[PDB]
Amino acid sequence: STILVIHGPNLNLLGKREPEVYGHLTLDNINRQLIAQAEQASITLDTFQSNWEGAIVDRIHQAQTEGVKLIIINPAALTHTSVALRDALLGVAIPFIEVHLSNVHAREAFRHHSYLSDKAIGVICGLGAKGYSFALDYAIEKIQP
Amino acid sequence: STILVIHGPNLNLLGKREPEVYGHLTLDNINRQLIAQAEQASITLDTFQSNWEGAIVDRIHQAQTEGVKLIIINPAALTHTSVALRDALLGVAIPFIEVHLSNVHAREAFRHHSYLSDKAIGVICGLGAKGYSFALDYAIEKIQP
Amino acid sequence: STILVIHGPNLNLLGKREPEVYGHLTLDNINRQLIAQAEQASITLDTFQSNWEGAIVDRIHQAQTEGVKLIIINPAALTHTSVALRDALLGVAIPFIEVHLSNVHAREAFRHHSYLSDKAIGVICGLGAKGYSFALDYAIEKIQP
Amino acid sequence: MSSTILVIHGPNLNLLGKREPEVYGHLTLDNINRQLIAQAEQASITLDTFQSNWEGAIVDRIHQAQTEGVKLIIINPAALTHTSVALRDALLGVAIPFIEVHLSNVHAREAFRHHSYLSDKAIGVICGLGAKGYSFALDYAIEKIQP
Amino acid sequence: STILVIHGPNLNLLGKREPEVYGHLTLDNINRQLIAQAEQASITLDTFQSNWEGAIVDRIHQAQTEGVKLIIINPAALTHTSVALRDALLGVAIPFIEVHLSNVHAREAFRHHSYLSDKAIGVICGLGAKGYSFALDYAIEKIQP
Amino acid sequence: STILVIHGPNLNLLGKREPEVYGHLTLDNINRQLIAQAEQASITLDTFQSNWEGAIVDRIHQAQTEGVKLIIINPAALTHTSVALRDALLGVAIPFIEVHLSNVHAREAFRHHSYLSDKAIGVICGLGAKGYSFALDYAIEKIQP
Amino acid sequence: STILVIHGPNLNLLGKREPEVYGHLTLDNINRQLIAQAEQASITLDTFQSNWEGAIVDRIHQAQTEGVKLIIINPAALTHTSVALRDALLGVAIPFIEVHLSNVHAREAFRHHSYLSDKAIGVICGLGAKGYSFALDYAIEKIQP
Amino acid sequence: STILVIHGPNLNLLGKREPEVYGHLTLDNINRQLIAQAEQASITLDTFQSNWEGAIVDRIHQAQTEGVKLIIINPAALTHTSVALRDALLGVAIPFIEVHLSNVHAREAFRHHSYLSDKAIGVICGLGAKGYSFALDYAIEKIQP
Amino acid sequence: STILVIHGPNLNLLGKREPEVYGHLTLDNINRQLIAQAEQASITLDTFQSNWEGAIVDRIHQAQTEGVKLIIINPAALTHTSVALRDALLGVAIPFIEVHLSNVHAREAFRHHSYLSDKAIGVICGLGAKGYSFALDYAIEKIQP
Amino acid sequence: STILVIHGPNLNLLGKREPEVYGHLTLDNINRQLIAQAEQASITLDTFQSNWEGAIVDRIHQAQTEGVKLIIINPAALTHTSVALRDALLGVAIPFIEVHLSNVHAREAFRHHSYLSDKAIGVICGLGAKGYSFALDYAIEKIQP
Amino acid sequence: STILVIHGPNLNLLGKREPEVYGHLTLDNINRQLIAQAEQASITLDTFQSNWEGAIVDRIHQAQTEGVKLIIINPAALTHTSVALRDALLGVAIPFIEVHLSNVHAREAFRHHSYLSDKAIGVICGLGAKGYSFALDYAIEKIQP
Amino acid sequence: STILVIHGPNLNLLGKREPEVYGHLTLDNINRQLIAQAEQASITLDTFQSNWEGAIVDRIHQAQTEGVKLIIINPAALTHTSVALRDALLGVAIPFIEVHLSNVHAREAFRHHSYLSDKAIGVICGLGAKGYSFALDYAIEKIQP
């Protein structure tokens, strides 16, 4: 794969309770949109979601051996807690863009601390699922001349 | 009606490291007592223990689909560290009670902070295994008012 | 008496102001429940409430002369401010359980601090008036297995 | 005058491109503005731009935006993000929603740059993606305003 | 009275519990020694103890009307909490020496802060009952060189 | 309609010590002025001062049973220390204006924090007794437009 | 004599941003009312609003030239950020009263800090536009007793 | 095994990405060296690595059941985040030595805090792979005097 | 080789208020002193004062296009608050020396923080007007040995 | 010697500078009072002052081999900075009383922290030279059965 | 009229390890430039360097007995640690100017705090050896206008 | 000397007399062991201990001039206090290894701060005397491949 999209814990819940509370959009809808968007630029894109920190770190190591040129990651809650994830990304030295659906600054003060943002190329928060599209747009421009 | 009891990391060792350090009470004994208690009010009681954060997050997602009405959780050490667990409980919107056998306020200062307590119905700490029963008792009465 | 229940300031308000705000349950109701629960096990139970910190300190000193084995205390606001209260309990060396009707951890940041919790056998918060019954059940069971 | 989108650029962004092109590329504030105007006009959205090194001018500009019918502000406040409560209270006082943009990754720099008087009140924030950040915010704006 | 000795909350417990392990010295023993020491110098000395903060503040007000020249105070736990007490002593402008039986720097970190010490002439902590005699000795020398 | 004016500890010392030092105005003088302003508006006005926190809490509870529409409180030292006072005012749900004679921000750092100000309608500090009269003016306009 | 009232940034919005949000009153209404009040007591009163820090600072420098006796200032957001403004007021040594329409202590934590309050005579917050009149009333009494 | 070696997340990357970035040395070379070293002493040694925190907790539990006498652990990023790991080691009560390849104190401030260091026998950092041989040397001497 | 001297807000008030407050020296005197010193060394020297942050930033930008080689800046109160000023000086990349008349370390704690000092060549404070001369001496010497 | 008195840096200046500033009392006067006081009770008493930390530490190691039973130390400025001095006293395990002439709590905030006070038997501050006599008075009664 | 220049620890190393890292200039050179400058103005100038804090303290005590009018001090590392040094300077009451060769603000955060700056007449940092000369120039002007 | 070992204050106390310790081992015992290990490797090794900071700084300056390749330092208490020590090791630019006998992370919170750790090659703590041997071991390998 060329672009790898990673989703952290609890994102599999998007759409799954009370459609109005969070709308109808699902994690699979988001993935579909991104696959199609990368097919239109003739880029191979893969995706991965897990609630387990270990699997996400294993996934990043595998990305190195697969030739991935850029990670788009929504670490979800792990932004605030996971030094392991920081070190997996630095270790394999694949550039990444951090994405959040919601504005994390608008929430509890503990959510203003990150172990990832300072090492990301850039960060997009609060723009919903479209944040991933923009991230992908950026990555496509930067990867093909 | 389903109630789910969740035990976090290291709670499997109860009873195992010496006859005396906090009892012969094992996790299995506790679980058996709570099972009996819940039968007597015709409540279905599930239990679950794991040392892996991700397994606990999965189990909570699973509870949403099972129509579990309330969660009694001893997150053990994850109380202090796991934002992912907080967001799992919030994401499924199943109300919960936090339980600890020991008094977390009597110990090191880093144990005074929690990512769950502020979102729990309530908290019971320091009353040993009976804390799980009290929480069950409370749950029984709040489900059939 | 064998067991003393102490209520701190403002708890005399319970169930006076607009009985559809926070319910129709007085301190009186709680004390009645508790007295009966204690009678069932042949334990003499005393109760006390005051808005005056000095009155509560005097009452704790009197408990010492009366051979009180354990104190169940809801200090309300005093949990955050009264080292005099911590020192009265430690000075008489009577073990105590701390109880709050509401989840103190869900309120303003200043309510996260206590001058009592770290010396309590245990704490129960947020489970309403039932918190006191649970505390009494534990106490009965520790005092006479 | 009337406009739907207002783009605000705070202090020092007029310097873009002008010191030693070697250092931080050849791209200028006017380049950025041209690109945003082209983009807006291509979606039939009216867009206006403003830059100043003076805080009170930016505040006046936001008050002016209220009487012009502006629906969304894309603001790169630059250094004012860390210091200007007045700016926050301007955006809030006129109740025009905004998106915050930074060319550079502000989390990658000094610790005093991690705090903002704006970010918590923004719809969202884009930092570190250079001039595309603005374009993405316009994108988002266009989709929210004319579905 | 020329000199007034004030004891804050809980100090009435001294000598009451298991005196052979927690000391046999009582507050009354302390008061008797200070009174004899003051009679020796032909100084009139009074004493007051209360568990109630408002009683102590009232007593400090009354001291101004009685022409007390100096106060020796062991505020006990109130040293850490009572601004009211600081504004009582400052409002009547009667100089004071702060005394503690025990060394407060050797206990919990919250006991290292005081609302009185910065305004006291000086402090004696950790020398037992003699702390009071020493304060008295200093006071006698000051009032009549 | 009653307004109640509460004065906290030490305010009884006003104008007693070297009236050349901090002024001639007494607490009774302040009360005389507020009663005149109230009577001029045909509003009933009650005043209360105590050095004891308990007396103040009880007084606030009584105000609830007496139909008091609004409280003007100068808590003096209690504004920095008394969560019980906060909870009494909130528990009776009578709105209130906080007054201080002096400018508390010009004094020691610990005097900058208040357990009341965030729940007051507003605060006046540093304008002497006129601060009370301003609060009362505001209150009269609020009750009888 | 002259009093000068200064209004800081964004106060020009008063009234205009929806009657819905905070009452019907406007900055010019406030200024009109205050001119009338000063004319009544034979005092000259000038007014000034600006969104720019330097315009305010220049205005205060001019006030010294004009022999202004007292400044009534609503700095709005600048109370939290502007050391320039503090040093302007201190530099011309014109005493001032700080005024806010809303209760700053009831809002975000960053609005509890001021670079002015400690050097003001006093502060009035949360009483609406009456805060300005009370300030004038205080100022008239200071100037012409 | 008498002695167990544990490597935390990301240590499997040693020697992979550009054998000139951090040399050619690999996690396998280290384990090789330590197994040989143990053999010379007639001590059985096991080794283990995982990116998943729960795997590491599980392996510590297993170690109790294997009679392991000492643990040499390089928790890597988990030293800063994992209370779960701390409580695993304390719960099985097996002494441990913490090892880090790099000087952890020379990097970002967040890397200076550890949930393990205070309960280790001791710590070795910054001495590359030899760190583990030294720990092993120490452990051999502790078990075979 | 042109040097630019920038004086920040309020420095235009030097001399004005009661000449005995810190003597008679005015901003104009200072500029004349430095203009002469610059002419004696055949160095073009420009000066600038403003109370407006914006004008100062515009000034620094124009300094780039004018080929200014070094700036001597007394930012007065803006040292503590203006990130915009920092970013202007780094944006144009003109080295600067920071000067203060008074000892900023001997005043309020807020004056101990600066957004300029860490990026200046160095800093002189508390040496009165000679501070600016010393800076120009250093600057002259740097610019033409 | 069974009692050693240590004076830290700068105490050698007592009396010296304008005896109409902080008295005519010198370090030697103090020593003399203490020596006579000790002689009256047939206890030998040694004294030592130095401005050098290492001399104080060496002096404490000596006292160990001299059978010194108690140290009375006024460490002066070292109480806030010297861990070496702390470790000396603890290393030799000679109990000590800390003395200061002035009320250290009435000064700068950095002066409230001590590396000694938590390990002293007790502390006396603010009572001038008599503080040393009081310490000695206690020490005599301690040493003697 | 004598001036004393004091150099703290490590400044003896100036020029020693690779004249090609931090110039060829030595402490001797600086001292030479200063003795010359002082001669030109008929001022007597003493100099002193030590790696030992007590030696520097003694040298300040000596400066008092020799009638030294002003001290120019580069305390190097001791500016962040030595309150003994602060109190020597204060205790002898000789005015001082603080000097540092480098910009301490541009280095580690612990280097921002000083025990001396707040009490110095002033401070010069980052202008190299010329800072001592400027300090001397200021001192000469103040001793003999 | 190719290698220099430095011991800081109070380590002279190791052995016989006892800083309340288990080991029986003395500072000379350690030194003999180290000299022997160094002779065996044909490497020359000097040692040094002092309770005087200044002496240690001097020793470090002398090491530059003696051609010392590497310093093994146990600074004991100085590791938390001494920036002069840090600046001496950086000044002479001799690489060092920091060694503590005890686990410094296991004791008081002030002991977790170091002014040396971040600039050492590495640190060993808690492994007693063997920590120094390990560090000698490492250095030997580094100086003689």
Q: What is the DSSP letter of D97?
A: -
Q: How far is CA K125 from each of CA G88, I114, K69, K105, K114, rounded to the nearest angstrom?
A: 28, 14, 22, 9, 13
Non-local (6+) Cβ contacts of D6 within 8 A are D47, D48, D49, D50, D61, D65, D68, D70, D72, D73, D74
Distance CA E5, CA E136 (A): 9
Dihedral, I128, I133, I135, I137 alpha carbons, nearest 10: -150
Among I83, I87, I89, I81, residue whose Cα is nearest residue I6: I89
Dihedral pair phi/psi, residue D135, rounded to 5° = -65, -40
| Backbone dihedral angles phi then psi of residue C123, each to the nearest 5 degrees | -135, 140
Helix ranges, B1-129 (H): 27-39, 53-65, 83-92
Phi, psi at C99, each rounded to 5°: -135, 135
Asked whether the beta carbons of residue B53 and residue H54 sit closer than 8 angstroms, the reply is yes
Residues of H in contact with B50 (CB under 8 A): 54
Pairing of strands A122-125, G70-74: unpaired
**Those residues with Cβ within 8 angstroms of residue E70's Cβ, 6 or more apart along the chain or in another chain:** E2, E3, E4, E94, E95, E96, E97, E139, E142, E143
Contact F81 C76 (CB under 8 A): no
Distance, in Å, from the CA atom of F29 to the CA atom of F24, rounded to the nearest integer, reads 9
H32: Cβ contacts below 8 Å, ≥ 6 apart? none
Q: Are D8 and D70 in contact (CB under 8 A)?
A: no
CA–CA gap between residue E10 and residue D121 (Å, rounded):
51
Domain range for H28:
1-145
3-state secondary structure of G89: helix
Residue H125 near residue H105, CB atoms below 8 Å? yes
Sort out which chain H residues have CB atoms less than 8 A from B76's CB and list them: 84, 87
Enumerate the residues of chain G whose CB falls inside 8 A of the CB of residue D84: 77, 81
Question: Contact at 8 Å (CB) between D32 and D134?
Answer: yes
Planar angle of CA G105, G110, G115, nearest 5 degrees: 90
In this complex, which of E55, E83, E93 lies closest to F77 when CB atoms are compared? E83
Shortest CA distance from I76: residue in chain G: G84
Ligand-binding annotation for B74, yes or no, is yes
Length of chain J: 145
Q: Do L125 and H122 touch (CB under 8 A)?
A: yes
Position L4: which residue type?
L
Q: Which residue of G has its CA nearest to I80?
A: G83
Q: Are G44 and G55 in contact (CB under 8 A)?
A: no
Taking the alpha carbons at both ends of chain K, their separation in whole angstroms is 12
The answer to whether the CB atoms of C55 and F53 lie below 8 A apart is: no
Query: With an 8 Å Cβ cutoff, are K122 and I137 in contact?
Result: no
- Render H12-34 in DSSP notation, one character per residue: GGTT-S-TTTS-S--HHHHHHHH
Stated in angstroms to one decimal place, the resolution of this structure is 1.9
Among candidate residues I18, I11, I36, I20, the one with its CA nearest the CA of residue I102: I11
Alpha helices in D9-97 (DSSP H): 29-42, 55-67, 85-94
Give the pair of three-digit tokens for residue A39. 């097919």
Spatial contact of K3 and K46, defined as CB atoms under 8 Å apart = yes
Rounding to the nearest 10 degrees, give the CA dihedral for residues E19, E104, L9, L84: 180
Q: Which residues of F touch C80 (CB under 8 A)?
A: 83
J141 touches chain E (CB under 8 A): yes
E45 three-class SS: strand
A 10 A CB-CB count for A145 gives 4
| The two structure tokens encoding residue A79 | 């932004």
Residue E122 and residue B67: Cα distance in Å, rounded? 67
CA of J123 vs chain E CAs: smallest distance (Å): 5
Give the separation between CA K54 and CA J76, rounded to whole angstroms. 14
CA distance G34 to G136: 8
CB H62 within 8 A of CB H6: no
CATH of the domain at G112: 3.40.50.9100
* F142 token code pair: 């609020």
> Burial, I35: exposed, middle or buried (Cβ in 10 Å; 0-12, 13-18, 19+)?
middle
CB A8 within 8 A of CB A77: yes
G14: which DSSP letter? T
Using a CB-CB distance cutoff of 8 angstroms, which residues of chain H are in contact with residue L105? 114, 117-118, 120, 123
Q: By the 8 A CB rule, do J92 and L47 touch?
A: no
I51 is in an annotated binding site: no
Which SS3 state, helix, strand or coil, does residue E94 take?
Answer: coil
Q: Which residues pair with K98 in a beta bridge?
A: K73, K123
Rounded to a whole number of angstroms, the distance from the CA of F67 to the nearest CA of chain C is 12
Q: Tell me whether C12 touches chain F (CB under 8 Å).
A: yes
G103 is in an annotated binding site: no
Contact state of I125 with K127 under an 8 Å Cβ cutoff? no
Residue G74 marked as a ligand binder: yes
Q: Which of C70, C15, C72 is nearest to C48 (CA)?
A: C72
E103: helix, strand or coil:
coil
DSSP 3-state of F72: strand
**C-beta of residue H103 within 8 angstroms of C-beta of residue L118:** yes
DSSP annotation of E53 reads H
* A73 class by beta-carbon count within 10 Å (0-12 exposed, 13-18 middle, 19+ buried): buried
Contacts of C137 (CB under 8 A, 6+ apart): B130, B134, C37
From chain H residues 85-114, the ones with a CB under 8 A of any chain A CB are 110
Q: Where are the alpha helices (DSSP H) in J47-110?
A: 53-65, 78-81, 83-92
Q: Give the whole-angstrom CA distance, residue E142 versus residue E70.
A: 9
Structure token digits, residue C129: 């008036």
CB contacts of F123 in chain G (<8 Å) are: 103, 105, 123-126
Q: Backbone dihedral region of K126: left (phi > 0), alpha (psi from -120 to 50 degrees) or beta?
A: left
Q: Which helix (H) or strand (E) holds L11?
A: none
Is position H10 annotated in a ligand binding site?
no
Helix K53-65 × helix L53-65 angle, to 10°: 110
* CB neighbours of residue H143 within 10 Å: 14
How many Cβ contacts (< 8 angstroms) between chains E and F? 53
Backbone φ and ψ of K25, nearest 5°: -70, 140
- Could you list the active site residues of L? 22, 100
Question: Which residues on neighbouring strands pair with residue D73, listed in sequence order?
Answer: D6, D98
- SS3 assignment, position F73: strand
Q: Residue F57 in contact with residue F92, Cβ under 8 Å? A: no
CA A4 and chain centroid, separation = 8
Q: By three-state DSSP, how is residue J124 classified?
A: strand
Q: Which residues of J are catalytic?
A: 22, 100
Q: Between F12, F52, F80, which is nearest E83 by CB?
A: F80
> What residues are paired with L5 via a beta bridge?
L47, L72
Residue I115, token pair as written in the block: 């957004």
Sign of CA pseudo-dihedral D78, D84, D90, D92? positive
Query: Do the beta carbons of residue I135 and residue I71 sit within 8 Å?
Result: no
Chain I touching partners, 3 or more CB pairs below 8 A: D, G, K
Tokens encoding D29: 């504030």
How many CB atoms are located within 10 Å of the residue C17 CB?
12
- The beta strands (E) that lie in chain B are given as 2-7, 44-49, 68-74, 96-100, 122-125
Identify any residues that bridge with J128 across adjacent strands, giving them in sequence order: none
Paired sense of beta strands J45-49 and J70-74, if any: unpaired
Q: What is the experimental method?
A: X-ray
**DSSP-assigned states of every residue in H32-76:** HHHHHHHHHTT--EEEEE-S-HHHHHHHHHHHHHTT--EEEEE-G
Q: Residues with Cβ < 8 Å from J80, sequence gap 6 or more?
A: J110, J111, J113, J114, J115, K83
The maximal CA–CA distance of chain E, rounded, in angstroms, is 42
**Which residues have a Cβ under 8 Å from the Cβ of G10 and sit 6 or more positions away?**
D59, D86, D89, D90, D93, G51, G76, G77
Alpha helices (H) along G1-145: 19-22, 27-40, 53-65, 78-81, 83-91, 130-143
Pairwise CA distance, residues F79 & B30, whole Å: 47
Distance CA F51, CA E58 (A): 7
Joined together, the tokens standing for residue C99 give 């109880």
| F130, G133 Cβ separation under 8 angstroms | no
Please state the separation of Cα J42 from the chain's center in Å.
Answer: 20
SS3 F55: helix
Domain tally, chain B:
1
CA pair distance G67, G65, nearest whole angstrom: 6
Token pair recorded at residue E136: 């008295």
CB contact under 8 A, K118 and I137: no
Judge contact between A31 and A133, C-beta under 8 A: no
Handedness of CA I91, I94, I99, I105 (dihedral sign): positive
- Token digits of residue H98: 């913490």
Closest CA to C76 of E81, F57, F84: F84
The residue assigned the tokens 């004071």 is E96
Burial group, residue D144, by CB count within 10 angstroms (0-12, 13-18, 19+): middle
Minimal C-alpha gap between F135 and chain G (Å): 8
Structure tokens belonging to residue C94: 């009577």
Taking CA–CA distances from A76, the nearest residue in chain B reads: B84
Say yes or no: A64 contacts chain H, CB-CB below 8 A: yes
Nearest-CA distance from G83 to chain I in Å?
A: 5
Side chain identity at residue F44, one-letter code:
T
CA pair distance K123, K111, nearest whole angstrom: 14
Torsion sign over Cα L108, L111, L112, L113: positive
Helix (H) / strand (E) element for A136: namely helix A130-143
CA dihedral H125, H126, H132, H137 (to 10 degrees): -80
User: What do you get for the CA distance between the two ends of chain I, in Å?
Assistant: 13
Residue closest to D122 by CA, chosen among D102, D143, D147: D102
The sign one gets for the Cα dihedral E5, E10, E12, E17 is negative
Distance of CA H104 to the CA centre of its chain: 14
* Distance of alpha carbon I37 from alpha carbon I33, whole angstroms: 6
Nearest C-alpha in G relative to F121 = G126
Confirm if A131 and A101 have CB atoms less than 8 A apart: yes
Name beta bridge partners: H4: H46, H71
